[PDB]
Ligand binder design. Sequence first.
Ligand SMILES: CCCCNC(=S)N1C[C@H](O)[C@@H](O)[C@@H](O)[C@H]1CO
Ligand SMILES: CCCCNC(=S)N1C[C@H](O)[C@@H](O)[C@@H](O)[C@H]1CO
Ligand SMILES: *[C@@H]1O[C@H](CO)[C@@H](O)[C@H](O)[C@H]1NC(C)=O
Ligand SMILES: *[C@@H]1O[C@H](CO)[C@@H](O)[C@H](O)[C@H]1NC(C)=O
Ligand SMILES: *[C@@H]1O[C@H](CO)[C@@H](O)[C@H](O)[C@H]1NC(C)=O
Ligand SMILES: *[C@@H]1O[C@H](CO)[C@@H](O)[C@H](O)[C@H]1NC(C)=O
Ligand SMILES: *[C@@H]1O[C@H](CO)[C@@H](O)[C@H](O)[C@H]1NC(C)=O
Ligand SMILES: *[C@@H]1O[C@H](CO)[C@@H](O)[C@H](O)[C@H]1NC(C)=O
Ligand SMILES: *[C@@H]1O[C@H](CO)[C@@H](O)[C@H](O)[C@H]1NC(C)=O
Ligand SMILES: *[C@@H]1O[C@H](CO)[C@@H](O)[C@H](O)[C@H]1NC(C)=O
Ligand SMILES: [Cl-]
Ligand SMILES: [Cl-]
Lengths: 603, 605
Amino acid sequence: QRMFEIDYSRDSFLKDGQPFRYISGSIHYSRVPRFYWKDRLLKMKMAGLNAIQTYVPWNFHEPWPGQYQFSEDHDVEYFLRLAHELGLLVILRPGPYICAEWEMGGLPAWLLEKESILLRSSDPDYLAAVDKWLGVLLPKMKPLLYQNGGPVITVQVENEYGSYFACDFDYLRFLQKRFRHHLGDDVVLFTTDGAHKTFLKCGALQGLYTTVDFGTGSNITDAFLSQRKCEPKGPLINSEFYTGWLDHWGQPHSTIKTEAVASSLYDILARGASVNLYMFIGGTNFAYWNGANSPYAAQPTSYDYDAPLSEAGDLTEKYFALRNIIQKFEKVPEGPIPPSTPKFAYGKVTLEKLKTVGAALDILCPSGPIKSLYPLTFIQVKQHYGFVLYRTTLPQDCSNPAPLSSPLNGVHDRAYVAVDGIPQGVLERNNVITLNITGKAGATLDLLVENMGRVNYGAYINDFKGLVSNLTLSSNILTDWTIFPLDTEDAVRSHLGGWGNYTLPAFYMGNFSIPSGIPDLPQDTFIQFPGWTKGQVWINGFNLGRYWPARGPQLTLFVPQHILMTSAPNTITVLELEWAPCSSDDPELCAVTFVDRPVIGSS
Amino acid sequence: QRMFEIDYSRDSFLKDGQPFRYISGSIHYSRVPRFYWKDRLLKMKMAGLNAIQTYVPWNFHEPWPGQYQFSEDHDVEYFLRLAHELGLLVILRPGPYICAEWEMGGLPAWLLEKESILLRSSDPDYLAAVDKWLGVLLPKMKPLLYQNGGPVITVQVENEYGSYFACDFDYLRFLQKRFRHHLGDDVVLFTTDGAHKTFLKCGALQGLYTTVDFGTGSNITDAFLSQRKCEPKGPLINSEFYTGWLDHWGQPHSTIKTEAVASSLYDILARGASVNLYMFIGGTNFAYWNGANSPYAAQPTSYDYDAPLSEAGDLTEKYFALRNIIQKFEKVPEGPIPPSTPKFAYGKVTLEKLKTVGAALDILCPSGPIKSLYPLTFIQVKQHYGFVLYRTTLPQDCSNPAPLSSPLNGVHDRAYVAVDGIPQGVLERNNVITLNITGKAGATLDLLVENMGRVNYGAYINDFKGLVSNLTLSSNILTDWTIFPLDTEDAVRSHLGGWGHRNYTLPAFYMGNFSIPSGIPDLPQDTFIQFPGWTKGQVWINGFNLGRYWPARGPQLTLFVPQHILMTSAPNTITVLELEWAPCSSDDPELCAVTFVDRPVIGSS
Ligand SMILES: CCCCNC(=S)N1C[C@H](O)[C@@H](O)[C@@H](O)[C@H]1CO
Ligand SMILES: CCCCNC(=S)N1C[C@H](O)[C@@H](O)[C@@H](O)[C@H]1CO
Ligand SMILES: *[C@@H]1O[C@H](CO)[C@@H](O)[C@H](O)[C@H]1NC(C)=O
Ligand SMILES: *[C@@H]1O[C@H](CO)[C@@H](O)[C@H](O)[C@H]1NC(C)=O
Ligand SMILES: *[C@@H]1O[C@H](CO)[C@@H](O)[C@H](O)[C@H]1NC(C)=O
Ligand SMILES: *[C@@H]1O[C@H](CO)[C@@H](O)[C@H](O)[C@H]1NC(C)=O
Ligand SMILES: *[C@@H]1O[C@H](CO)[C@@H](O)[C@H](O)[C@H]1NC(C)=O
Ligand SMILES: *[C@@H]1O[C@H](CO)[C@@H](O)[C@H](O)[C@H]1NC(C)=O
Ligand SMILES: *[C@@H]1O[C@H](CO)[C@@H](O)[C@H](O)[C@H]1NC(C)=O
Ligand SMILES: *[C@@H]1O[C@H](CO)[C@@H](O)[C@H](O)[C@H]1NC(C)=O
Ligand SMILES: [Cl-]
Ligand SMILES: [Cl-]
């Protein structure tokens, strides 16, 4: 009969009738391959953590209504049993909105099939979806509660609701009530908000324990004074003590100094507070999982965060510093700490052109294009992530430049424009809404539109993507559209059908071998694209994510060794969006480079 | 069809009618665990080598007569296939004597069951056993000959016979006949000797191609003219170009500069000569496989040799520089080079004493001892390697120290002496032939005798080991011996019977465990083990005998520990046999401990 509870009399948690406080670090299972889940967790224990904290992204697990992913890398139950096996308790944060620099805050984009939906409110179509989701997730989590022999000790309802404009208290009351139904009356439910009465006003609720977040810049006495105003009794809790900070493409890489973190951490622990270090390891936004902030600016592939464990799991100076702080409070485990993984530079691998996007439409769109008078959104067209080709035919003649414009800023988020197979340039959400083009009447106008990531914070999380308003040409609304949803994932895995200034968006491919019978190969590596511009990359069909060395700060992408093979050659595929170094008479330039050190902080 | 031959007309080899010169590197499969064979051979290929050279040590395959080892780490057949699948050719040196800083130059100790045997001669008994070995080994090598689809292009007969006193050309001719009988008339047979007519006089034989060896100290012109005296036509060949040199316990670690090796390799290659690098990777003398020189000085566990690839297989600056040399003459393979393995510091592990050697006699010697009026040698007692316990009783009270002595200097090679369970010190071949002892009349006198390695070079390779002559106490010969051969390898694998059968301290076994976690892709890793406070002994991890430790003498302080004998979840058990002094007395356990570190210390004091 295991018990975990707040005792108010005494300003703390009781675990099994005894005083308890947690020292946790965040780890997101959706951002670390399962291959490495025990590595990262074990390193977390060795630092002195008695708990971990994680988010459950709805959209990672329910990509379409009634279609579930809980296997392999999506096996959340396994991740929690793994944490338990290693002696770690768990703080579970199941949203349904998690924020987290992740696609639409973890909300599934199919919710937007109701165009008018008010996300994160008592909108009844939103509520009915959430209830179906909780009715699949929470029964999986019930046996992993502490009270029933598992690791979960507390659960977060919603995520920083006090920061959302809606302030719908019946939304919260619904979530409480549904969580209580599936989890019982004993589980400690709580909320997390910014440490200021302005944020706690809409975020707090009777019957949910109110906690705060804040990092190294904040006055710690005040942050806790604002929590105490909402909970005069119970434990002090900083649910997200920032070890670092997010990035955006085109902005310098964020860093927080080791001593600042140590200092504040020591101060927080000395008060007897429970605390969670956000992030302890950040990892990677593989494939299309990154989020974005408003006004539109996307987060990059790497979620390194300047965390104590680096993107690839490495032990940093910051890791050891915090471990030494934790040591002043708790006996920390003995034994040697598992190492940073070995990294190998496989070198330069030559690639060659396979097919433009243009030529691969039979294989990218086997079901055929959809015809619309005006443009349709990604959502209307049944695609959530990646790329959609919008094709029209020129009505006038344009031997002289003619402005192609989205007057309402309706290219969400970036379009690669070509006319009769000649690249014209690029349109960008907020930055470039007009572009001059040329060609003949009846010439095919092509727009390859990229969803660069759905906003995850603020008001504009209802982010459809695509051409969301009309385009004009010499101010005349363009009409009659042939819209091609693109199955890039399937096409890449099948080598685009056949197996056994700007350029046109295209796929380039090449191979490299790794000898078998070598105990220490393959190893993890980092891939680099010197001379390429913007695009997507797969290795052996695994989408490692986005590259953009023309904007930075991220130049390299992380490649975990377990996708690499020795019995047959490894295939690298690059989808270049802007300009490829491959026209030239020198095939040597049409190439990528594997290196043994990340470059995630370029100027 | 496939042909490899000498073209005398043109001072070259012909490979399928095409000109061919080899750039080889020595690797000894018996000094590299099988688990890493492929790693090292690929590292060799990427250096630009097109061939490898290796020795087949007879004692490594036939530890008793008619009883063979050709599996796992002894599968030379698989080694040779592996080299062939990587596109490498092979030059085989099957002895039957190989020298090679290896126990008895590779010769099995059991040949000494005939006391008067003249090794490496027409002694009919030596010959009959050589013949029998070749009837086993050579037919396995036949399909690996180049002309039959395998990698082996040349075969060395004997090893520097010209350096040996006997000069028995009937012996050489007998080898030549039997090599022909088993392998045929087209295989290229050759000899290797020092580059000087004094060595070449007895080493060279009509019908066997004469090659020389020499290193970075020797004048290349002179060395190759000495070769031209015996073979005026055909290729130039240095079969052992020294990349480094051997070690002995107690001397500074041998090194040869990267520039000296590089510049010399260049000049040899420029003459259009075929060359083998000795060693390319040296590796390790695990167990009791090291040898020794005369006057008695044993080589240690590490055969790092200062080779281009280090003991644990690392790419050194020397490797890259030789590869650059080779590049000036040939296309070198494209692609990146497999890396240096990662090393891990598992840290301190505490040990505790389980049992003295005296206490463990029952399990070390389960068929019981041999009784004898005078002492017997390792050979007569049917033991070749390791330790033998000799026991007798004092025939007179020695309350005043009385001298125990081996007048003819016959403690071969080290004895650890105890009286009624009290240690008295050490007798040493050459250095200390007298030890004073105290005890009562009829007290038990125990000598723990260690074979430190049979001599591998010179006239004194018939090195029996043990008490090879009498002992005296107060000048009187001690009689009535009880002699226990010790099956240390079995006993350690059963944890001294514990796991069943499915100033000095007494020699004793010290055990401790350590765990390594599972589900971590990068553990276990290669490591090095170090013995602060200990003195001299043997070490095993999970029953694999990693060799001898002697931090008291050096130059080697760490022993190499390869990853594949370490296990996850299940406890890893360390067994240290300390012979002289363990740090395990003081009421402080933390000192009774060994330590695992991530860099080797073979180059210290
Ligand atoms: C710069 C805008 C702030 C948005 N993010 C906020 S407030 N954060 C708190 C939020 O709960 C968490 O998911 C993370 O998103 C964290 C920042 O990494
Ligand atoms: C100190 C005596 C050395 C004798 N060894 C000689 S001459 N050498 C030549 C011999 O062929 C080889 O096996 C090696 O033993 C080499 C030394 O590494
Ligand atoms: C934090 O604020 C308090 C008042 O709430 C003030 O006394 C204290 O000095 C401040 N501490 C720091 C470090 O600024
Ligand atoms: C397009 O070209 C016209 C005429 O050359 C020019 O006036 C206008 O500024 C251009 N607009 C853009 C966005 O380049
Ligand atoms: C585009 O323009 C038409 C006609 O002006 C308008 O009625 C329609 O709503 C617009 N469609 C989009 C997607 O903007
Ligand atoms: C795979 O590897 C090489 C790269 O060197 C490439 O050129 C070759 O065509 C590829 N083969 C297949 C079957 O894809
Ligand atoms: C080596 O010896 C030869 C004598 O045969 C001599 O001609 C030459 O000077 C020497 N060469 C070198 C490089 O020492
Ligand atoms: C042994 O003891 C005698 C004293 O009887 C002494 O002369 C001699 O030096 C000692 N020998 C050794 C080898 O220590
Ligand atoms: C031991 O002693 C006696 C001398 O009486 C001699 O007969 C015998 O050969 C000696 N044995 C050895 C092994 O030295
Ligand atoms: C060490 O090794 C094995 C592990 O099963 C066992 O026989 C021995 O009793 C162990 N002792 C300790 C302290 O782990
Ligand atoms: Cl989290
Ligand atoms: Cl060799």
